[PDB]
């Protein structure tokens, strides 16, 4: 499928719209992205905030100022000519019921599908908690794609500035494991589609891999037969500083 | 008379097409916006007026504060013609709207027109004229056409928001009569005892 | 499981590289060069 | 598209699932029975006038007894040729899944020809010809080995109508984080 | 003297983007924040000014299209004034030209605190932002001539030449200042998300060598031994060793696939 | 008004001298998160290493809590706090603090901080100061060799 990248500028400036704004008592702040959609990989160079207010009790509440859309673009058109509204960023992880109706409000406005950015401000998960989800036909459903990070000289030389492999992904593989405990117990309190349908896939697709173990094994001595001559290779690069700096001790006694 | 900033909430549910105005009144309220624009525009040398459609279209806002009327004319013609009204949800639109404009010292007032009831209960608007009350927001109700076949369900919203003149509260009641559609709020207290016209 | 006590022999001798390296070159310096 | 709104009136619905009835019997595309309990096809109409044939249809494929396909559909109906070729393959796709599920402990989903012998009531000859027809279809992976007399067969079908492994699963997955985190443990150490 | 400008980890970015797009032209940005005293520069938020081909004159500063942004940035949660703007001189140092300081000139009258920022975001690549800002003089601790800038530590003068010609003699179009950054520990990981998503990626590159592993262990022995016979003609080392060590990294990779 | 608030951060250090006050510590360590004046917070960093003076192990309550923020002028009088509190005879834990401090923080303010502490530490015997001021004087970043330079200053004066 298509793939989302993110220059760190669009996701530092939405982590501290939070703060800026002072936004308190379990809000959410809502803000455009810019960039080209028409491509394979969705790059996001540009990114603003909008005020938006909608009622906790009341889902079917919701207002969002149409001028700023407007004044962004004749912003951006006499700045950069390449940027276009390709949809719109929230505040939290958590998808709420409004996505849709905010998806209306945009379709007119974008000449492509809207993308829908999901970026956490707490960053109480592991790894990339930004997530990014693209809206299609089902009514509708959001299509996640993963999401990278720009490599460029105008984006990572800053971060560089600013802040100056297993064990990691491990930690990984538990986070997406206990989401998967709690959806089946609290599937059992309400009870006594789509999850059931795709958990049975995992099981049948580690019991399985130890039918493959007698030809795994096959690769994995050659892995210490490039070990063997790996270290071996390390001796002349430590033999010969032994006798560069046997030489350098007869230099210093004949001096 | 002095800055305040205007708020115009339309009706696009199914008995606005009627024929209490020529052609389709879902049309007519074209003109209205129009009237009330060249009426405030004129009297304050910075003033604006918004829109916002709450009727079958969800809570959504056609146009917000501006001096243009390009724009708000050509989005009327392409919005929803048919749905449902709902006056809890579309007041509250409106509050949140007024935080938006340019001027802080400009007057609070939200002015509605109401084609059909709504199904609603009357209960959600007790509690909504307290909120508008407390916050000093002007509301100006318009009620026609609804009157033959119906009761007025907004009376029960005036009777809590109840206000003299002088700040808010301001209910309105137009004849079925053989007259002109801007003429019926002309009449009315509403672009009336201020400073030019 | 024998491929893995020959690298280990590896890393001993790299460690035992490191117990005397410097350690005679140690009085260089203390005492006064030309 | 008819329950949400555009004439949700009874008058339509019972001409429909009169032609419901016809294709879930006749069409061998999406399981059998499993559609049907879905949709409130059967609670909507009544049980008698030629509608209970919809209710054997479960009671034909799990037992597999002769004298209930025989008394499942008359001459008014059977008479179309459509239905008689497949009248075998309603009950093979049936009695093959449920053997792959009882047969299944860890890693051996196999079968032989003597548990589909039993199952179908057919020799050897019918056995390869019923099955690979469902596997071309996409329902399985697998095969079949008429030498060895054993069938291999993979994991296809997502069998829907869950419940049973739920409670199951749940302790699998323990498992499985339970082993990660003692791993992960061990690779923070050393 | 020496005078400490904090600005926000925000507003870095922004500068650096918008004058790294356009390589040419020399474009210009507005700036917000707060101060302390005379003595500290804050910058929180910077805006961008629209582009125009003259090159930063006193016909490229449009006061219509200021006057529209700056309501609506009222309420977006910006309290703060207009601090300054920030300059681009792509390919050279940190200086300021005769029409740069006329231009300068022209927004005494409006606000006196307002900074001028001179920033190379060509030269910035190596992963130190060479930055300066110019401060316009507001006085209130200076009248005629004072001392002002307290905290003088860290940078020197540098720039190029006429700035550090007069210092405390002229202050008042232009003298030196020094670039200063202010962090929180929410900011801090908010730049280090680059290390389930990374795991399945990092099992891409193990994916497609399982078909080359034969091809991929046979080029890199082969390679060694034509390697290890030029240090037997030599009577090298480095060639040899940044050649084992990328075969030592790969080895431990496919382990950890198992 | 952070004009005459240089010297009151910096009046109110020298009679917390010795013993001093034990609110005096919660309330001057607060209030410095939450001034946003540049000499108000630098001085009441200072201050706070005049709060306790002589108490050793005493004070790990105060230099746990300067050292744990994320702040730059903060991390800058911790590193005086263990200077006073260990001045004269001192601990071998406390120069062990001070060395991490000059080596993981990238402020340049803060490593010559914590290398100019390591004279009043040492006062006790000035014989083996210059040991370690001849291994960190060496190194790079110039600030860290002005602070190693008046290391034997301080103690062998």
Redesign the interface.
Known sequence: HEKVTIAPLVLLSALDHYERTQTKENKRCVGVILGDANSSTIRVTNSFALPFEEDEKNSDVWFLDHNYIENMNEMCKKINAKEKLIGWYHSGPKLRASDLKINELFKKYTQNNPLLLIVDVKQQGVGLPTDAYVAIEQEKTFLHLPCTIEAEEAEEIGVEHLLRIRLTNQLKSLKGLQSKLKDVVEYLDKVIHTILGKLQDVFNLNNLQKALTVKTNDEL?VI??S??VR??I??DD?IEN?IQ?KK??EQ?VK? | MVLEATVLVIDNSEYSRNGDFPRTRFEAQIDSVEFIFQAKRNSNPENTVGLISGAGANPRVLSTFTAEFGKILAGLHDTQIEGKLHMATALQIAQLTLKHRQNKVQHQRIVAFVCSPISDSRDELIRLAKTLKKNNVAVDIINFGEIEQNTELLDEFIAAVNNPQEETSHLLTVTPGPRLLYENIASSPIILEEGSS | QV??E??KF??Q??DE?LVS?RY??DK?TQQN?? | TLEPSTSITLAERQQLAYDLSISALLGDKIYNFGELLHHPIMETIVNDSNYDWLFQLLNALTVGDFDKFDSLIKVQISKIPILAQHESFLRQKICLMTLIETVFVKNIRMLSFEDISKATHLPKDNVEHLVMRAISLGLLKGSIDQVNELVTISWVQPRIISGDQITKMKDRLVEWNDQVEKLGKKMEAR | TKETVYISSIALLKMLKHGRAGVPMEVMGLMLGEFVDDYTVNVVDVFAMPQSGTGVSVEAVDDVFQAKMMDMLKQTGRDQMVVGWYHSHPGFGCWLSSVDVNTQKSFEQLNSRAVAVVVDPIQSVKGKVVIDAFRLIDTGALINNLEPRQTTSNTGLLNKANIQALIHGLNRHYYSLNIDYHKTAKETKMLMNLHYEEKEESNLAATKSMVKIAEQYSKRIEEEKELTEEELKTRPKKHLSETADETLENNIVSVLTA | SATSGEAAALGMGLCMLGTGKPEAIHDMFTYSQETQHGNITRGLAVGLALINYGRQELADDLITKMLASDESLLRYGGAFTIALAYAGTGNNSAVKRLLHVAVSDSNDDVRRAAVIALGFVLLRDYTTVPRIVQLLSKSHNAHVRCGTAFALGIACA
Do not use: G, T, V
């Open positions: 001595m210490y037969i070990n063997l270290s071996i390390a001796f430590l032994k700096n350098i001790q210093r001096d | 491929f893995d020959r690298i590896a890393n001798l790299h590289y390296m005679p070159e260089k060069e030309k």
